[PDB]
Design a protein around this ligand. Structure first.
Ligand SMILES: *[C@@H]1O[C@H](CO)[C@@H](O[C@@H]2O[C@H](CO)[C@@H](O[C@@H]3O[C@H](CO[C@H]4O[C@H](CO)[C@@H](O)[C@H](O[C@H]5O[C@H](CO)[C@@H](O)[C@H](O)[C@@H]5O[C@H]5O[C@H](CO)[C@@H](O)[C@H](O)[C@@H]5O)[C@@H]4O)[C@@H](O)[C@H](O[C@H]4O[C@H](CO)[C@@H](O)[C@H](O)[C@@H]4O[C@H]4O[C@H](CO)[C@@H](O)[C@H](O)[C@@H]4O)[C@@H]3O)[C@H](O)[C@H]2NC(C)=O)[C@H](O)[C@H]1NC(C)=O
Ligand SMILES: O=C(c1cnc(OCC(F)(F)F)c(C2CC2)c1)N1C[C@@H]2[C@H](C1)[C@H]1CN(C(=O)c3ccc4[nH]nnc4c3)C[C@@H]21
Ligand SMILES: [Ca+2]
Ligand SMILES: [Ca+2]
Ligand SMILES: [Cl-]
Ligand code: NA
Ligand code: NA
Ligand SMILES: [Zn+2]
Length: 806
């Protein structure tokens, strides 16, 4: 109930909410069916429009007008945004040359530069260049402020997940808004676009910027606006809030445009009907900046112009129907569109089987435009698994396509020409970032980054301490003139042991054999030095990774590679080696095909054994440092140590072998040497975080050899490729992957063909940030470089995406 009999007189766009049954006058009352009877009349005036005309100047104040051109309007804080231009001979903000804002220039009483978050729905990254002629205001912000060529949204590239990620710095899986539509089995409730359930606080996890601000004593404008409140009125409301007395006035504001998303859906990303919405958004920005200039705030306020995702061409004729694949199409519930999520229609159906559903959707048609996954098998970079609202079965839909259950659903529920939601690496889904103000840099271009990073920065801009989030704080310092956050390296938790030769060959009973009994103080002093780490400055370029958790492990040195060998997991946590441009690929000699050698520095009890692999009919093994890249026939013996060995399904050995024999060399050629760090990842609960040993669900049969869910590699070289990887004087260049360790290659529909037609495509799909590997291993890389820590944090958040140019 709401007793809508109260009045909004003096309460228009009040900042604190009132609880029913008192009627409301805040910018969300419409949405709650709760405004006072007189809201429209007092708060939503329209009389005479939004602009001063020549014959309104000096007018007698008339309260019925949407905005005023009267002489007392500046003091009352309610002039039309163009007042000074029409009536006081002023120029528009867009006509003024930009001049660096070296320090905030604010009125007395302003404790901090305010922040205005101007968010635009569906604003595709390429609009910055392609629409540039019709967006003079936005282009001024862009070229005079700090901008990125594009910003990477989170997956799914939908509205609520992205807007709430902007607000919290969290992945949807952590914030809980995992789509525009959800079922929560624990609540037994559904979240929809239309309806009252989405208003319930229980959907919304983490801590959005407005709450963070409020708790730390920074006052926040109410972020949201009911759809019917026109853009011009939202702008005038923010500007009014900005005239409030010091003690009442918020420091952080939000504006949201439904455009250009709304039109994009109807007309496609580049439909000729798209020019007008872009003009209109530019006009709104024009008004904001003109209104800031009026109040002397245009060199005080930090402005963020930010989109949530792009927009792609998508028509009804590009729809895949699950009814062309499943016989049982009525036993399932599908969340449809640009992603698919499937669950059983009924919990009381024990004949429902996800395994047979996936198989029925796997590589069934030649140009099939989606790919089924169990959620834990999705590329780790999407971070889309660790929430009970995300269904076990997911469909990654090709760009430009939809997935639906039955044809009836499409024609009884073509209209649309645009949609979004696809993989967050897709170019058409990329969106925009611009920061403009005293705290942002002047005329600075920064590299693409992910929207999860912004929460931290907005906290920095307001002097706030961010709640724990998925950003890497300091990784965006290069956007800021001041307010940078100076992080320190996490402290190493476990120090390594440096074992010497401690065991005799005969103490080992591992069922391994090697034809290594083929036998000089010249070459014996040499190999001693190698085992003590003589070549370590070659193979370990950035220092050893720090172990950030309590464990027991050994550093092992070799001519060609160095490892951190875990006595707990019986394999290295990491293996580091450098391949120079000149390096030579060689084969495993015939006599050594099945060679595994005990490591006389590591006890039998902390070693794997060959018997368990023999007995395990499903599981074979591979090596972290590849035998193919051994620097000499004698050095090759090192690569067969039981301590370089890791469990691999024969299916995955196909991927691994090709990576080690063909791809490392190719990258070394193209990048002028590469440093490689490779290792296992255990993420059995798919939380993105290193599993503890009691979380492992699979061992090589008969043993305590744990089976990785994934294998990673981090591939570093010199950004200036005229310098060899091992002699780099400046910034680095990185790409990484986290390959799922699967018993089949069902993921790649081409896998019965030669590795050269599918392996690299799969690796690219599973591209990763070094930071993703950090979370998954509890390791901290790049500890010893000559680079600043902020620059290294940026490097660690880099994602190599393999999309062409935007
Ligand atoms: C990205 O960033 C985020 C944010 O930093 C990272 O997420 C954090 O990771 C931590 C480790 O997983 C986790 O810490 C746990 O907290 C548990 C209680 O937490 C509550 O309070 C916090 C703080 O206010 C709150 O944020 C939480 O909110 C979650 O849940 C609510 C309600 O369901 C949601 O609305 C909200 O969206 C959020 O959901 C997400 O997180 C939860 C995990 O908490 C997931 O289950 C969801 O799917 C969703 O993704 C909570 O309200 C606490 O119970 C844990 O403590 C257990 O384990 C520790 C080990 O140290 C041990 O000391 C304790 O004994 C305890 O064990 C007991 O419970 C076990 C399991 O039930 C049981 O086996 C035992 O026998 C014991 O009984 C733990 O400390 C932290 O909550 C989240 N925070 C967020 C916001 O998600 C995330 O990891 C980052 N991602 C990457 C890739 O880096
Ligand atoms: O009011 C906020 C808000 C505005 N700003 C916000 O945050 C700004 C900030 F991130 F900067 F903080 C947030 C936060 C998510 C809560 C919400 N809104 C109002 C609209 C839009 C965001 C939501 C999504 N809706 C839709 O109808 C919709 C829109 C486009 C679509 N394309 N395809 N399907 C679509 C469905 C309903 C809601
Ligand atoms: Ca959107
Ligand atoms: Ca885990
Ligand atoms: Cl969704
Ligand atoms: Na085997
Ligand atoms: Na296959
Ligand atoms: Zn949309």
């Amino acid at each position: 109930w709401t007793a809508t009999s109260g009045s909004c007189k003096g309460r228009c766009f009040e900042l604190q909410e009132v609880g029913p049954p008192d009627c409301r006058c805040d910018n969300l009352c419409k949405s709650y069916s709760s405004c006072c009877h007189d809201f429209d009349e007092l708060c939503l005036k329209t009389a005479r429009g939004w602009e001063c005309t020549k014959d309104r100047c000096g007018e007698v104040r008339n309260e019925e007008n949407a905005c005023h051109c009267s002489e007392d309007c500046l003091s009352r804080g309610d002039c039309c945004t163009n007042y000074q231009v029409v009536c006081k001979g002023e120029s528009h903000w867009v006509d003024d040359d930009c001049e660096e804002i070296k320090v905030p220039e604010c009125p007395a009483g302003f404790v901090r530069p305010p922040l205005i978050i101007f968010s635009v729905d569906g604003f595709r990254a390429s609009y910055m260049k392609k629409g540039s002629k019709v967006m003079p205001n936005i282009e001024k912000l862009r070229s005079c402020g700090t901008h990125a060529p594009y910003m990477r949204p989170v997956y799914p590239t939908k509205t609520f997940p992205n807007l709430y990620t902007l607000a919290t710095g969290l992945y949807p899986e952590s914030h809980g808004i995992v789509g525009n539509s959800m079922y929560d089995p624990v609540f037994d409730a559904s979240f929809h676009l239309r309806g009252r359930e989405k208003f319930n606080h229980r959907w919304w996890g983490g801590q959005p910027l407005w709450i963070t601000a409020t708790k730390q004593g920074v006052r926040a404008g109410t972020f949201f606006w009911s759809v019917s409140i026109p853009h011009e009125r939202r702008i005038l409301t923010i500007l009014q809030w900005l005239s409030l007395p010091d003690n009442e006035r918020p420091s952080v504001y939000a504006f949201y445009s439904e455009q250009p998303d709304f039109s994009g859906h109807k007309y496609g990303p580049f439909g000729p009907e798209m020019t007008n919405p872009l003009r209109e958004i530019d006009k709104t920005v024009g008004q904001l900046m003109d209104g800031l200039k009026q109040l002397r705030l245009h060199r005080c306020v930090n402005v963020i112009f930010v989109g949530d995702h792009g927009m792609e061409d998508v028509t009804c004729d590009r729809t895949e129907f699950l009814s062309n694949y499943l016989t049982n199409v009525d036993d399932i519930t599908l969340v449809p569109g640009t992603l698919g999520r499937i669950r059983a229609k009924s919990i009381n159906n024990s004949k429902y089987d996800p395994k047979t559903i996936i198989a029925a959707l796997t590589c069934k048609k030649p140009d099939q435009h989606f790919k089924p996954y169990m959620k834990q098998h999705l590329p780790k970079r999407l971070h889309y698994a660790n929430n009970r609202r995300i269904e076990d079965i997911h469909l990654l839909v090709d760009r430009r396509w939809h997935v639906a259950r039955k044809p009836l659903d499409v024609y009884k529920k073509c209209f649309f020409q645009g949609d979004h939601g696809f993989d967050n690496k897709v170019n058409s889904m990329q969106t925009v970032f611009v920061g403009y103000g005293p705290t942002f840099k002047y005329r600075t271009k920064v590299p693409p980054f992910e929207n999860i990073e912004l929460y931290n920065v907005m906290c920095d801009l307001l002097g706030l301490k961010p709640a724990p989030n998925n950003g890497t704080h300091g990784s965006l310092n290069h956007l800021l003139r001041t307010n940078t956050f100076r992080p320190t390296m996490p402290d190493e938790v476990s120090r390594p042991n440096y074992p010497g030769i401690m065991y005799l060959q005969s103490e080992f009973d591992l069922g391994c054999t090697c034809d290594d009994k083929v036998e000089n103080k010249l070459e014996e002093l040499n190999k001693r030095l190698h085992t003590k780490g003589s070549t370590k400055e070659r193979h370990l370029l950035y220092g050893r990774p720090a172990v950030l958790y309590r464990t027991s492990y050994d550093i092992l040195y070799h001519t060609d590679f160095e490892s951190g060998y875990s006595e707990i997991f019986l394999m290295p946590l990491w293996t580091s080696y450098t391949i120079s441009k000149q390096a030579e690929v060689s084969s495993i000699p015939e006599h050594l095909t099945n060679c595994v050698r005990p490591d006389v520095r590591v006890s039998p009890g902390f070693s794997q054994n060959c018997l368990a692999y023999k007995n395990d009919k499903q599981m074979s093994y591979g090596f972290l440092f590849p035998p193919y890249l051994s620097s000499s026939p004698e050095a090759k013996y090192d690569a067969f140590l039981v301590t370089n060995m890791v469990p691999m399904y024969p299916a995955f050995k196909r991927v691994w072998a090709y990576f080690q024999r063909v791809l490392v060399k190719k990258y070394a050629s193209e990048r002028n040497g590469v440093n490689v760090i490779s290792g296992p990842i255990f993420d059995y609960n798919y939380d993105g975080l290193r599993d503890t040993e009691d979380e492992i669900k699979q061992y090589v049969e008969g043993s305590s050899i744990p089976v990785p869910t994934h294998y990673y590699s981090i591939i570093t070289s010199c950004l200036d490729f005229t310098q060899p990887a091992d002699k780099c004087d400046g910034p680095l260049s990185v790409s990484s992957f986290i390959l799922p360790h699967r018993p089949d290659n069902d993921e790649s529909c081409n896998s019965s063909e030669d590795e050269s037609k599918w392996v690299e495509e799969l690796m690219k799909m599973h591209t990763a940030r070094v930071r993703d590997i950090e979370h998954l291993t509890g390791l901290d890389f790049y500890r010893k470089t000559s680079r600043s820590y902020s620059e290294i944090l940026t490097l660690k958040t880099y994602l190599h995406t393999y999309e062409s140019e935007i």
